[PDB]
């Protein structure tokens, strides 16, 4: 790998610089290199990894949606035939997106998840696994679509089970997991009632535990609780 000659600490330093410069492709490449050193990641480093890939795939998803909409419009009645170009370019973006997802899943499988014993690290990586299978599911149309959806569900479910046993209801990782699994239910699994129930129960159980928190922890937890409320508002 192109980052094999660079020090772990230098890769982490450069990932932080890349973030400041909004160079998220570079940031992701640096963090991939850092993971491939083979040592476990600290909390800060896990955050760098997640931020980098979230931003790269986020951009690809937004582009994919623009292109898919144009393609859908091209297939309506009365639309003039414009050739294969829209499908081709949507496919190009799609293939790049799938590549990034496969890269992240690969890092998680080789070997981040298996080395992650603490609840905070294990839940974080399993959430990521659910997220990147969810992104694959968003674009899936073939024989394996159900299996891709089930892979997301399984990863999220394992993360949920650990989070409920090992973390308080206000823990930001537990909250963010629940937020995203709720979106999975709504957008991927065609289960809006499950999505709404999860978001509500997560919000309410967090509300009841805020009294235990410092000001700074309260700030962190309430931010994500607001995202849960925002989704509930969108959905009800």
């Amino acid at each position: 790998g192109a980052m094999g000659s660079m020090e772990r600490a230098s890769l982490i330093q450069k990932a932080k610089l890349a973030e400041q410069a909004e160079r998220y492709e570079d940031m992701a490449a640096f963090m991939k290199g850092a993971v491939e050193k083979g040592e476990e990641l600290s909390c800060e480093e896990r955050n760098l990894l997640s931020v980098a890939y979230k931003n790269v795939v986020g951009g690809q998803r937004a582009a994919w949606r623009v292109l898919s909409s144009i393609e859908q419009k091209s297939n309506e009645e009365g639309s003039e035939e414009k050739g294969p170009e829209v499908r081709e370019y949507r496919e190009k973006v799609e293939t790049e997106l799938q590549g990034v997802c496969d890269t992240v899943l690969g890092l998680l499988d080789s070997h981040l998840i298996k080395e992650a014993g603490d609840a905070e690290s294990r839940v974080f990586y399993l959430k990521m696994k659910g997220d990147y299978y969810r992104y694959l599911a968003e674009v899936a149309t073939g024989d394996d679509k159900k299996r891709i959806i089930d892979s997301a569900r399984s990863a999220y479910q394992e993360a949920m089970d650990i989070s409920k046993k090992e973390m308080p209801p206000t823990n930001p990782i537990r909250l963010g997991l629940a937020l995203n699994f709720s979106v999975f239910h709504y957008e991927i699994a065609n289960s809006p009632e499950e999505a709404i129930s999860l978001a509500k129960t997560t919000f309410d159980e967090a509300m009841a535990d805020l009294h235990t928190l410092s000001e700074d922890s309260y700030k962190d937890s309430t931010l994500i609780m607001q995202l849960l409320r925002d989704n509930l508002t969108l959905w009800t």
Binding site: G176, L179, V183, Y186, L227, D230
Partner: peptide
């Protein structure tokens, strides 16, 4: 689109 983190 809904919020995720």
């Amino acid at each position: 689109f809904p919020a995720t983190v």
